[PDB]
Design a protein around this ligand. Structure first.
Ligand code: HEM
Ligand code: HEM
Ligand code: A1CN9
Ligand code: A1CN9
Ligand code: H4B
Ligand code: H4B
Ligand code: ZN
Lengths: 419, 412
């Protein structure tokens, strides 16, 4: 009927009715909760390939309805024309095309709806680049460069999304094969260890296989591997002057700069699927700006990532015999101090996890005020260090799936037939 | 039906069949997940299937299912429910029930020790003085001069609801909280309400920072009664730091024995409304939650102050820096006094080992990621990366209303 969530630090109780508009399954049941499953559900809104009219149109009707409801219409002339227009369009092309307004609406609301995104207070300030006229990988390279350059903005990062042509039959997808626009290569060393970023060893090998010439450093920005209209993907090197990087140094430890660490400034997720009114935009790279922990905790300290903890602990002269000295926890703090200090010293947008989580609490409040709820994944929202000293740790959250949304999709090299 | 859980750090995949045996709700629906919600007497007819379920499972665990003894027990339980509208667990069933309620505690990271549980049967207890005696012996046994040992003491089960046994304390050892006229709090701000209840019941408070609270014990539905745990049974650890000589000057201490006492133990449909159980601490419970939660002792600013940290902006991570040192202090202090403690790294690693074993021998292990992940350094512990299925098996430990919200006072 209606569900309350409580913050146990402040005893604020919020009352959620927005979940009544939830469309697809969470993966949980009355008897089993999957809230820590990374991909709990395969409930998609349309079949795998080109859907029949009774399949795609209801999804379309729902989104147009929602969009016109959003803008204080519904039933207006333009709404009833838009329905008949989408009707005839599906009647004659098995798909339909979004107007520019609806596309901008759907992107912003997919972001707004992203229960895993702590950054959503910014949701309505999204720059939407319409790339639906794109037709070749070279055109995708042009569009993505413009995205990177606009979003980077000489460090004053700007949120943006570039939306390439929607899926038609499934054999013609546009995909950015890179999981993110800018990542560092991972190199399988002969002994068995790994140089660079271990997460990317496979993708780095597809790139080498596709003819990329690895510099074989620790921070080799990977080429783009762009696929247009289902064709074989093509490699492009992003102009280095477009890839802003921050050398990581520490405000107290002078020896820290000598770890040779740097990171890139723009986080740009490029492997997710944007779904609006039943249409599926398989190539929609979206970017914002980093939360320090993503680099300082996950990218740097995960065991199967850069794994610098013991290296930094050594330089710190920390008791590393046993776990209880908390040498890992201590170094982990210093690394995230360095990351934050470095980005701010170079005037590159970055938000610490205290500020970010605080903003999200404010966002939840706004959303419950105006929308009647805010889907949020507590497992993703709580930062990967110092969880309980951030306000979201003490904040109950309801999770549910609202459309438009960003969705996971298979890695294209698992599903692509080469030519 | 099967369900797979992945570890994204190791790629190990486990297959959960055990979830097919849960029965009460998780709180989640098919379209909403409530996995971060903290909190989401039986008739004769209701009790028979619950009883049979538990007796069936006990006899299954001991490879005696279908046996002569299984079937007579089942019939013997049915007669009791017919006669008395309830039944009595055998001692073996009580021990097994209690161990398995711990085993099934999806929020508990220390379940690798679930089968080493000392079970104190206190179902013959009739008065608050009796409960105190039992609880004193529990505390002495568990504390074991710092070599802490897991233990539960089980008092008589619910009958009509009018005769509940209750430990009104949320935990057996807690420090008192006193709000001052000026709004400030002395002691443990969490326990201010419960301290007020004791003071009203007659407890004379020392009004200090680490006053061990008195037990407030209710037997057979009667008004609860006050008892002072004998001070020699409350092992405490003064918190010092290995590096900062100044840390001892914070005057911090903590009690060695964590002993939860406000929960309900549910075995075969029977409700044991008073079942205090204890183990030993994970360091972050004290060092992160007890000390650094804002609603708690809130010593981050104090500790950061003494670290000459820049506390102007959050991005200096002064809170994270001070939190780590505090948790080092907690572990170093307990270890130096040879009082059992476990750091969150060692604890999470053992629980993964345990979880894996539980999938192998039992077909799964229900687990609450929101509670298993430590409250600091979350992703540098192995559990953060471990997918976990959450579901509710019985026997279970269950939450229950605070007794002062339900008790109807006898004394005029
Ligand atoms: C503007 C600054 C932003 C910040 C600080 C931010 C923060 C974050 C963080 C920390 C995560 C978790 C990332 C991880 O642990 O891998 C996340 C997830 C996510 N964000 Fe945001 N975000 C921002 C902008 C955006 C934008 C512009 C979009 C889309 C238009 C977006 C959509 C998402 C989605 C879909 C996820 C889930 C990703 C997944 O499931 O793998 N975010 N965000
Ligand atoms: C032996 C060492 C033990 C360790 C290291 C341990 C560790 C923990 C921790 C860290 C929590 C989370 C507590 C919180 O954040 O408030 C917890 C919860 C819990 N533990 Fe264990 N525990 C231990 C023993 C036990 C025993 C002996 C029992 C029962 C016989 C038990 C049953 C539970 C239950 C039911 C919870 C959930 C608490 C709640 O829901 O409020 N644990 N444990
Ligand atoms: C828009 C946006 C803003 C922001 N501030 N952050 C993000 C998240 O962006 C990245 C995320 C990752 C890691 C993704 N992670 C890998 C392991 C996993 F698969 F298990 C879960 C997903 C690497 C990157 F380079 C990223 F830019 C996105
Ligand atoms: C057997 C066992 C071992 C262990 N290692 N730990 C525990 C849990 O022990 C305690 C937990 C708490 C606080 C519980 N917490 C209160 C705030 C909340 F209500 F929000 C959520 C529950 C206080 C204490 F004194 C504790 F001993 C139990
Ligand atoms: C809102 C949220 O569920 C709440 O803060 C939970 C989070 N995880 C927790 N985890 C543990 N171990 N103990 C807790 O009290 C909590 N509190
Ligand atoms: C198993 C677990 O769900 C997985 O490791 C999750 C935990 N929470 C996370 N939270 C964020 N923000 N990002 C992640 O990659 C993860 N990983
Ligand atoms: Zn759930």
């Amino acid at each position: 009927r209606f569900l309350k969530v409580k913050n146990w630090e402040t005893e604020v109780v919020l009352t959620d009715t927005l979940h009544l508009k939830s469309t697809l399954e969470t993966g949980c049941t009355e008897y089993i909760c999957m809230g820590s499953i990374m991909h709990p559900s395969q409930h998609a809104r349309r079949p795998e390939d080109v859907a029949t009219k009774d399949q795609l149109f209801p999804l379309a009707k729902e989104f147009i309805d929602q969009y016109y409801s959003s803008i204080k219409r519904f039933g207006s002339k333009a709404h009833m024309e838009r329905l008949e227009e989408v009707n005839k369009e599906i009647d004659t092309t098995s798909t339909y095309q979004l107007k520019d307004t609806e596309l901008i609406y759907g992107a912003k609301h997919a972001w707004r709806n992203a229960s895993r995104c702590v950054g959503r207070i910014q949701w309505s300030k999204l720059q939407v680049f319409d790339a639906r006229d794109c037709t070749t990988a070279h055109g995708m390279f042009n569009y993505i460069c413009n995205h990177v350059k606009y979003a980077t903005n000489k460090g004053n990062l700007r949120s943006a999304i570039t939306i390439f042509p929607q899926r038609t039959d499934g054999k013609h997808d546009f995909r950015v094969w890179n999981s993110q626009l800018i990542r560092y290569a991972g190199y399988k060393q002969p002994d068995g260890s790994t140089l660079g970023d271990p997460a990317n060893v496979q993708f780095t090998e597809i790139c080498i296989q596709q003819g990329w010439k690895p510099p074989r450093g620790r921070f080799d920005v990977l080429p783009l591997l762009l696929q247009a209209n289902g064709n074989d993907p093509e490699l492009f090197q992003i102009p280095p002057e477009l890839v802003l990087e921050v050398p990581i140094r520490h405000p107290k430890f002078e020896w820290f700069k000598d770890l040779g660490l740097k990171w890139y400034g723009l986080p740009a997720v490029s492997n997710m699927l944007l779904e609006i009114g039943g249409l599926e935009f398989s190539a929609c790279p979206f970017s914002g700006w980093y939360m320090g922990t993503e680099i300082g905790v996950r990218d740097y300290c995960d065991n199967s990532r850069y794994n610098i903890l013991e290296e930094v602990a050594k330089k710190m002269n920390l008791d590393m015999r046993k776990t209880s000295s908390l040498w890992k926890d201590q170094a982990l703090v210093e690394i995230n101090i360095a990351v934050l200090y470095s980005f701010q010293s170079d005037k590159v947008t970055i938000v610490d996890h205290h500020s970010a989580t605080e903003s999200f609490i404010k966002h939840m409040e706004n959303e419950y005020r105006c929308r009647g709820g805010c889907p949020a994944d507590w497992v993703w929202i709580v930062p990967p260090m110092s969880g309980s000293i951030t306000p979201v740790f003490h904040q109950e959250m309801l999770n549910y799936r609202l459309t438009p949304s960003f969705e996971y999709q298979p890695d294209p090299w698992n599903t692509h037939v080469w030519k």
